[PDB]
Symmetry: C5
Subunit: 260 residues, 5 copies
């Protein structure tokens, strides 16, 4: 692709605004946004997580206005934030008291907050904590796993092309690809780490690369991806479940002429 | 709305006030505190009492009347901080000794520090931890909740239009709206989180957007909103109460011509 | 007053001061410490002893005398432009051998830790205070200056509680904060870090300067050729072998550069 | 003498990944060390080879160039590959409390990377100068008690994989003129990993004179350590866990004399 | 009065390391203190010398200036930049010897707890002010400590002025840089308190600190001597018994200097 001029004038810009719901496992009709309680295998050989115990990547493919030496929509800016951060102040709903007569233990512990904006599906590389883990039917996971899959097995390449299917723990953005995506993520690990969730409508991320070029939307499609595992909820029994929240996206795009 | 020139010269005004916290105020001695926390045994039986629920604070401030092609007040800058941070050093008032012969456990745990400045009420989106929570009479809460309310139900839209009414835990700023408000908040979660509270009279936040335009005050009203849940106080017994503090606002406004 | 030009040439001066902490000093051996903390039996009966309450520190520093001759429509005032500051004696908190509480069997003593308040201000007049009470039913002791006529509203904001930091070892830290509605002629800075296990994090350097000018380029203007310096440096608590806990404070160094400013 | 940058055929890119070398104690445990044991005394400290993480290195031949031209490394993009794998708290872990999830990877971490025009230069520093390092490792020789603080005899090059233990070597700050290195040790028994990923961050490798590493013999050297913390199994036993590191380096031709 | 920089042997570099001085309680324990004992009463605090970490200092001779008689002006070496880091950070990964398990079957507790990381570069000795945790502490023979201590020594006794002019002598816990002096030194330090604080140690050869003041002048080396000072108490090592020893690491310094004419 030779990238040529940006179009200007009123008709040259469009906006996408939406939210992506979290896909934490949803183990019953009352527990949207939560995983199944987390149960521990007695060996690496016997690790066999149920589908409703595994958070997955969220993805949306957003059609843009049809454009067609062609024009492509170029993603320029992102505003994003996590929706519902104050819901984590519910310390009165079958939580585990943190001491005798105390309030319930807030959601805390391992978190993964991730978002991406691209002109095509996010490209994934598989990495397994334990290559002998048996992933469940209904999920898309690294196949033909070997012990090398615990560090780097280049066979595990996939596209984030289905919602509620790609387990978070199996897949990361492939840093060897993703030229046409901008991605951002943070894993904070530990059973007691505190969520720190900032909200504001005053913050913008610029999506242009060092050449001044943003993601270019192939086929006039914008891909948005997210994970917002906020931590674990500990109930009165001591059982723990992942808890996720939705993510808001607002993306500004402009028409860009290319030669491909 | 077409935004035209800033007036110069009579063209400026300042709003200064404090917003008191609304933590629940369970009796005549406990302004700034909630009721002590109790925990349901199931999600279906979660039924928090009104005095156990911190709520958003709001003040709707009349500005000097304009226009008897009009002028509007434009909010340009904010100074803000939390008032009374040192009160949290009281570790001697019938708290829970941290060990034998020790001082009382200080206020700590989950905090939410939030403020907004707008030219109209803050727009809210409801999100529920547990959609089966029964919110109490005298609060304004997400109605017709479903399990999807635990992640995003677009029916739950409201305005922060009443003080001591909108519980913190079931509402956030709506990021799909609020074009005419600037909002900022941080939730820090965990029972052992230490309050970290900074004070200074030297820090200013600019409220202009990327086009150089601040909130424009509809009807010559400025809306200030806040939450400052600092953490929980632990009583000798182990029972825990939310503790909040007031927030200072100083807003500088200027007259802007609009069509 | 209208602020006019800065004088150049005899036109600058420097104040260098240390302010000692006022933690309560319960006996002739315990400068820098409070009395050990005692907890009231009921919330209503909170009644801290004076020597248990850290107080704000203040010094008023006389500057070189200005306006010795009759002047017409204008005077000079010293304008505070820059500050260097840090906490003096941070390494003393490495004494983990002086009859503290072992962290575990055979271990070293638990270091000073827990709730801290580090605060400083520079002004051309006393720091203006607003009272806020944790518990409006607390009985504050003789020898302290505390919010009077307390009501339940005092727990969040009672505008009756206005004071000046105009006496050392008198205004309890827990009762008073800088009044954000006043202090036009002071620059203040503070951080409360709350929690019994909070670690002190104390930085020292002679390479860091804070500029005291406001957005109009004007620093504090020293009324009567006096500079007001205020501080609190509650570093945390020391835990004795018995488990009893005392606040521990440290001194604060101040270096302020001032220039002569003409005012109308 | 460093002269002008060539412009125009003047650039090349290296992209690769370095796998971690944590000890690999059996055919199922690539990326992990042996379980960590505690010798009774410094005198008895004799760590098993499989318990010792090592530095990773790759030597990458570049396009042949030859007053000569050298490849100059200008920019780096890097990140840790597989950070989400640490979400597996359901595999032979130790419950944090009754009915809880497994304790996640936590505790001491070392995240380190370097880009140079020659092998990374190492200085040995020993926690305990009496440690017996095992056959198959390359370690500080003729150790003395001064090796616990600084013994200038302990100089080496990071010139072999599965060989140089992390705990006894650091980048030599007295050398490495032709390398850029970056590392963070985060200690503590319970510290939580904090791992950021993004394809939007670039590190510039030029020094204060505008000169990057110059690749001797048209070879680029990449080195890494990514000990993420320890995995606690159901018994309470702990193993180091490491992850691979991605590198993308942009290079340009530079004339030198 | 500082005049122009001389250009053209107008620059020199100092590169060295300073070893830590933690107490070295026996022939095997260089870099460690004696294990910490606690006094039976506050008044009876009496630390042994080998329990007390001390400040490190080196005085480095520079190329001799002013060999010929000069009239009203001399040259001085001016320190302009510093590169520094802690040497041996990975040694703290030895959790496999002589330690106390973190939990049943776990690895040894790592070095953690109170740290002090400090460095200075000056054209003369670092100037110190004494502050005592406890004025009734008996400091041991072989150390240089605040003398004629009074209760005011617990907060600020201006008697307690010293120069960091001897290695293995000035206890860390007794002394800090004197902010009322040190015009001709640049100093930097951080105390991180608490028994469980985790070390966070960064290394890189890409970071430079500029030593120039707000007038563009660095430390000026009196008598062509450069003073480097350091403390790097990284935390405490815990033995199986529970006893705890301070552990320190060496510090690397690289300083660039230029010749500056002065009146
Ligand atoms: C900050 C504060 O007020 N702490 C109190 C709390 C709170 O007021 C309460 O948790 C807020 O919801 O209450 C503590 O318990 C007292 C509370 O239960 C009251 C209610 O009337 O009763 C007190 O005990 C009475 C007892 O009920 C009588 O039978 C007896 O004659 O007198 C007792 C003493 O008045 C409880 O102490 C609490 O720990 O939650 C006390 C805190 O200090
Ligand atoms: Cl479940
Ligand atoms: Cl009780
Ligand atoms: Cl093993
Ligand atoms: Na709540
Ligand atoms: Na695959
Ligand atoms: Na107090
Ligand atoms: Na609703
Ligand atoms: Na000491
Ligand atoms: Na009063
Ligand atoms: Na998982
Ligand atoms: Na050697
Ligand atoms: Na090791
Ligand atoms: Na002395």
């Amino acid at each position: 692709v030779e990238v040529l001029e940006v179009k200007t004038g009123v008709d040259s810009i469009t906006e996408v605004e939406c939210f992506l719901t979290p896909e934490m496992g949803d183990p019953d009709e009352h527990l949207r946004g939560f995983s199944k309680s987390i149960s521990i295998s007695d060996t690496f050989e016997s690790d066999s997580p149920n589908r409703d115990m595994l958070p997955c990547y969220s993805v949306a493919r957003i059609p843009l206005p049809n454009l067609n030496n062609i024009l492509m929509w170029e993603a320029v800016t992102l505003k994003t934030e996590v929706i519902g951060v104050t819901s984590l102040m519910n310390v009165h709903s079958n939580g585990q008291a943190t001491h005798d007569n105390g309030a319930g233990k807030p959601v805390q512990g391992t978190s993964f907050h991730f978002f991406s904006v691209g002109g095509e599906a996010l490209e994934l590389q598989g990495v397994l904590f334990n290559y002998r883990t048996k992933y469940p039917d209904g999920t898309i996971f690294p196949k033909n796993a070997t012990v090398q899959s615990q560090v780097m097995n280049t066979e595990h390449k996939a596209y984030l092309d289905k919602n509620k299917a790609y387990p978070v723990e199996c897949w990361v953005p492939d840093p060897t690809r993703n030229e046409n995506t901008r991605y951002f993520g943070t894993l904070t690990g530990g059973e007691n780490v505190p969520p720190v969730l900032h909200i504001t409508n005053t913050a913008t991320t610029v999506l242009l690369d060092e050449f001044g070029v943003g993601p270019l939307c192939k086929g006039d499609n914008l891909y948005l991806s997210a994970v917002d595992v906020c931590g674990m909820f500990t109930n009165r029994s001591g059982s723990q479940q992942w808890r996720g929240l939705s993510r808001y996206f607002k993306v500004q795009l402009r028409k860009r002429r290319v030669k491909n």
